[PDB]
Every structure is written in structure tokens, then in C-alpha cells.
């Protein structure tokens, strides 16, 4: 299996790199070798390794975007995906006020990008990071934010209702966005959104454009079982979400459905 080997070579050489980006680069590398489309279809039928929503979402969006201009199409598509994060930070970091109390979920490079863009604009704020422990990743987020020279406090997992009254805004990076405006993320997003709604705090979602999946879960069981695995995945209602921060602009949760209707899956 050379596709999984190239995926591991593109994902393990840079630990600050996303998985769906490396998957679309693997699809483009198969498109470099019609026979190229057949090899890309073979490896995308053979890429059933990662259980993330963003990987399969980017694979489906590249499978639609591919359908001799396919290589240049994937080239500027990966150019837009690579230049997405700077537009994410530049459109999102303007909402953080001075002296605010930041609430943050587990480790993701997107919220780290928007916090380093926020401290790049001369802003002072304290960040409360939930530990989020099926595995210690919120500690890794607090360690990577302590190197950023910002005041961070490692918060216990069952204290998001304890610290909600003092955290004025709740900014959480999501790993998958369904059509209505809800998000698929790590399991502690639902309780944080419900405690933010009961305390009237604005719940912000910071995710890119390739995480737009065409799914519609009603309950916590209606998310697919291949993305669940002690679950790793919850679901947040779109009524619990104030705004989204994509590269197309700062969007209300009803705009993702507009983009997916104009895109047609």
C-alpha cells in the first residue's frame, strides 16, 4: 500500500499539518501518474484509515471538484486550502476584546492560529483550556499556548459549567460541519455549548470550508458509527452556535446550508 505510505510521509513529516490536506495531496500525487483518475479512485477506495470527518469530507469535495485540467484544478484547490488558514485568522481574530476570558476545547491548529493572530494584534487575554481527557490533548494545547506567552490555565474536564459564568465568550474549533450549521467535534463540545446557552454566552465555531459534510444527525446516535470510534464524537445543535468563521467570510450557521445547496454535495 503506497498510498497509505505517502499519506504517512506527508502527515508525519509536519506534526502541525492537517490530515485531509495530506489526503488531497495523496489524491493529487495519484493524479500525477484515464489511468490517473482510475488510480485516484483506487486509492480513495483504499484510504479507509482515518476516522475523521474532515478527511472524508475533503475526499468527497475533491471527488466532486475533479469532475487534462484535473491536475491544475487540484493544484489551485490545494492552494486555496493552504491559504485558507490565514484568511481564517484574519477574519476571526477581530472579535476578541481586551481583558476577555477565553474558553477553549482540545488541541487544534486553527484555534492556535487565531490566538497567535490575536496576540499579534497587541491584545491581552486569559485562556481557560478544558483538559478533554479520553487522552491528554488539552494539556498539549495549554503547553503549546504557554510557549505563545499567553496566560493559560489547565481546567478540569467537569468544570465547564463551573467556569462558564466568568468566560465571556466561548471559541471552539470544530473538525466537521454538517449542513444546517451544527458541528461534529470532540465529545465535550455538546456540554460546553449547552452550558454556554444556559449562561447566554456566544458560542463561536472556527472551522474551514472543506469540513462541510452533507449529513444531518438529529440525535447523538444519528452520527455515523464509523466516525464515532467510550465515544470520541458528539453533536452540537445549530441553535447552540452563534457564528462560524470560514474563508468565505464570517458566516451565520444558516450560510453553510446555502453554500452546500449552491455546491450540490
Amino acid at each position: 500500500k503506497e498510498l497509505i505510505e505517502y499519506f504517512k510521509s506527508q502527515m508525519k513529516e509536519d506534526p502541525d499539518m492537517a490530515s485531509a490536506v495530506a489526503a488531497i495531496r495523496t489524491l493529487l500525487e495519484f493524479l500525477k501518474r484515464g489511468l490517473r483518475a482510475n488510480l485516484t479512485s483506487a486509492i480513495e477506495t483504499l484510504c479507509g484509515v482515518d476516522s475523521s470527518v474532515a478527511v472524508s469530507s475533503g475526499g468527497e469535495l475533491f471527488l466532486r471538484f475533479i469532475s487534462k485540467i484535473m491536475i491544475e484544478r487540484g493544484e489551485l484547490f490545494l492552494r486555496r486550502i493552504s491559504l485558507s488558514r490565514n484568511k481564517i485568522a484574519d477574519l476571526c481574530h477581530t472579535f476578541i476584546k481586551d481583558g476577555a476570558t477565553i474558553l477553549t476545547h482540545a488541541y487544534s491548529r486553527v484555534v492556535l492560529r487565531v490566538l497567535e493572530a490575536a496576540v499579534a494584534a497587541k491584545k491581552r487575554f486569559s485562556v481557560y483550556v478544558t483538559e478533554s481527557q479520553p487522552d491528554l490533548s488539552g494539556k498539549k494545547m495549554a503547553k503549546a499556548l504557554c510557549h505563545l506567552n499567553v496566560p493559560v490555565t489547565v481546567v478540569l474536564d467537569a468544570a465547564v459549567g463551573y467556569i462558564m459564568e466568568k468566560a465571556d465568550l466561548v471559541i471552539v474549533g470544530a473538525e466537521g460541519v454538517v449542513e444546517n450549521g451544527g458541528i461534529i467535534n470532540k465529545i465535550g463540545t455538546n456540554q460546553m455549548a449547552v452550558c454556554a446557552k444556559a449562561q447566554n454566552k456566544p458560542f463561536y465555531v472556527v472551522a474551514e470550508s472543506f469540513k462541510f459534510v452533507r449529513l444531518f444527525p438529529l440525535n447523538q446516535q444519528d452520527v455515523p458509527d464509523k466516525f464515532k470510534y467510550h465515544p470520541w464524537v458528539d453533536y452540537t445543535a445549530p441553535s447552540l452556535i452563534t457564528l462560524l468563521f470560514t474563508d468565505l467570510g464570517v458566516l451565520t450557521p444558516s450560510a453553510v446550508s446555502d453554500e452546500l445547496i449552491k455546491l450540490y454535495l
Binding site: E165, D168, Q199, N200
Partner: protein
């Protein structure tokens, strides 16, 4: 005899059963100058009620009990009649005259109830002046303990809640909340107060002067700026005029509104009420029992273009300024009484344990 005052203006169709008078005219135009039917202290009390000179909820009760002391001191006993029946039959037109002057607060209702219970329980073997001294001493002890000792107890129970460095929001004019703020500032707490006021009474200026004279840093603003400042406000003090059986808070008209906006900004509200101001009476809206103020009070001078000057010539125009409203009991957190920190659901509990049960 005492006639009825004429209703002034065009009433609200929801408030047609409640009377709406004016402060321009008085009822004593057709009364004798030596006051014979009404006691002279009682007609003095009705004049200082109707003109708006006594507006505080505790000040009306204090002036009521002083006028009742002046009535009982100027009481005589007819032959073959008991004091415990004749004083009951004579104090009812006095309270009717006071009601026709201005609608009574529930503190004054409970004062009438307690005084009627005390003058009902006067023995027949007691003399005239001896029973007069008993009733005056009972009124003195009543106003003494159940004003100042309850005020000091509520002041200590709110002093043990207010911490250092917080901000406090108040509304309206109330001597109890102002005394809490003064005795909290003098005993060592360092805080600043955001004063919320409302039209047309503008009674927030009184507690504003009371907080500046006490050395407290103050902030003054109105109802629409309260929504602007409640994201910075951490604590709201309120002055209750009556507490009902379900836990509702009868106060000034901007109380339930401010409590709802404070809960929307997660700011806990605190009402401060003494236990004689409670009610076995209950209501759920501001429509079935309320006080109607002057319809000529809503007009103001913004330049030289007063629009509500000739408001009575417009047939389809209605003027309304409500005095009292109620809160739903799930919006108010504290009820600070002299027995301790109780919730809103404990008001008939305190009524039971203070009603000899």
C-alpha cells in the same frame, strides 16, 4: 360626609376598574376647616399623601402610625360603649379617606390589620387612658422593632453577602437599600454603585444624593442604559414594596423588567423587604390590582415642542404611568429578611411562623 374624587382623564380599557386621580385638585374643597368627620391628623396625612410629599414605602407606614398615635391620643369614650368596638367602627372612614386620597401600600394594609387585631384584643375592664397608653406603647414598640431592628438585621445580612471590589446596581428610591449601601460603605467595603432611574417620578436622584453624601462612588443612568451596563454589573439590589404568596415581588414598575434583563446578562438580583410588608393576597400580573398615577406627568419639555400638552383633545390617545408590577418568582434569587437569607418560595413560610403558627 366624605364624597368621592372624580376620575381624571380617559382610562385604559384594561385599567377601567382601577381609579386614576390627579394631584391638581383636592378632596378637601368641600370639607370643614375644623376637621370633625375626619381627624385633623388624618386629613393632614391625606394631604401629604395626595400631593406626593411622602413617597417611600416605609415613610408612609411611619407617618400612618404617627397619625394613628395622634388619633388614639385624641380619642374619648362615650357612655355605655366599648373602646374595642367604637374605635374599630371609627377608624374605618379614616382609612377610607386615606384610600380615596391615594391607594394604600401593603405595608399600610398590614399596619391596619395589626392595629385592628390589637384594638380588638383590649379588655373591657381596662380604663380609658390606661388603654390609650397601652395602644400608644404598642404602636411605639411595633414601629421601633419592626423598622429599625429589621433594618439593622437586613443590613448585616446583606453586608455579609457584598464582597470587596464588586459593583452594585440599584433602582428607585428605598431607605432600606440605601441604608444597606451606607452601612456597607462605612464598615469597610469598597464598591461603586450604578443607579438606575425611570420616568416620570425620577426618584433615583434621592438615593444618588444619599450615596454621594455617604462617600460612595456613584453612576447614574436610566432603564435603556441598564442593558448597556449589566454586562459589567455583577450584583443588583432592589427595593421591594410587597411580597406575595407565590413569591412575587411588588415594587416600582421597573423591577421585573430589570430582573429579566439581569438574568439575561446572568446578573443575580437582590430584593430587600421586611416581613410586615408580606401578603396573603396574591396576583400574577400588573393589571388586576395596581396604582394609577397622573396622566399629566408623562409630558416633558424637550426644547419648546411639548407634544402631550393637549392630550385630552385627541380622543384616540391614552396616557398611562404604572406604579406597581409583579415579578415571576423564578426571576428573583434573594429575599433578605430579618430571619435570614430565604428564597422567594419562603414568603408564606415566614407569614406562617410570624402569624403565631
Amino acid at each position: 360626609q366624605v364624597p368621592t374624587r372624580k376620575d381624571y382623564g380617559s382610562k385604559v380599557s384594561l385599567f377601567s376598574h382601577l381609579p386614576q386621580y390627579s394631584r391638581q385638585n383636592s378632596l378637601t374643597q368641600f370639607m370643614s376647616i375644623p376637621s370633625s368627620v375626619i381627624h385633623p391628623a388624618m386629613v393632614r396625612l391625606g394631604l401629604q399623601y395626595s400631593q406626593g410629599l411622602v413617597s417611600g414605602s416605609n415613610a408612609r407606614c411611619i407617618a400612618l402610625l404617627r397619625a394613628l398615635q395622634q388619633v388614639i391620643q385624641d380619642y374619648t369614650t362615650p357612655p355605655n360603649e366599648e373602646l374595642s368596638r367604637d374605635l374599630v367602627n371609627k377608624l374605618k372612614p379614616y382609612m377610607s379617606f386615606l384610600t380615596q386620597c391615594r391607594p394604600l401600600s401593603a405595608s399600610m394594609h398590614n399596619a391596619i390589620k395589626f392595629l385592628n387585631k390589637e384594638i380588638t384584643s383590649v379588655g373591657s375592664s381596662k380604663r380609658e387612658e390606661e388603654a390609650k397608653s397601652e395602644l400608644r406603647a404598642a404602636i411605639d414598640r411595633y414601629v421601633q422593632e419592626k423598622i429599625v431592628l429589621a433594618a439593622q438585621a437586613i443590613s448585616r445580612f446583606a453586608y455579609q453577602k457584598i464582597s470587596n471590589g464588586d459593583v452594585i446596581l440599584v433602582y428607585g428610591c428605598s431607605s432600606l437599600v440605601s441604608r444597606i449601601l451606607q452601612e456597607a460603605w462605612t464598615e469597610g467595603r469598597r464598591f461603586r454603585v450604578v443607579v438606575v432611574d425611570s420616568r416620570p417620578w425620577l426618584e433615583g436622584r434621592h438615593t444618588l444624593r444619599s450615596l454621594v453624601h455617604a462617600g460612595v462612588p456613584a453612576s447614574y443612568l436610566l432603564i435603556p442604559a441598564a442593558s448597556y451596563v449589566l454586562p459589567e454589573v455583577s450584583k443588583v439590589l432592589l427595593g421591594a414594596h410587597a411580597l406575595l404568596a407565590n413569591g412575587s415581588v411588588m415594587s416600582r414598575v421597573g423591577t421585573a423588567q430589570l430582573a429579566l434583563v439581569a438574568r439575561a446578562h446572568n446578573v443575580p438580583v437582590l430584593v430587600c423587604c421586611e416581613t410586615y410588608k408580606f401578603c396573603e393576597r396574591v396576583q400574577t400580573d400588573a393589571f388586576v390590582s395596581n396604582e394609577l398615577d397622573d396622566p399629566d406627568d408623562l409630558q416633558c419639555k424637550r426644547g419648546e415642542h411639548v407634544a402631550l400638552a393637549n392630550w385630552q383633545n385627541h380622543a384616540s390617545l391614552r396616557l398611562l404611568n404604572l406604579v406597581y408590577d409583579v415579578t415571576p418568582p423564578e426571576l428573583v434569587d434573594l429575599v433578605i429578611t430579618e430571619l435570614g437569607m430565604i428564597p422567594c418560595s419562603s414568603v408564606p413560610v415566614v407569614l406562617r411562623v410570624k402569624s403565631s403558627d
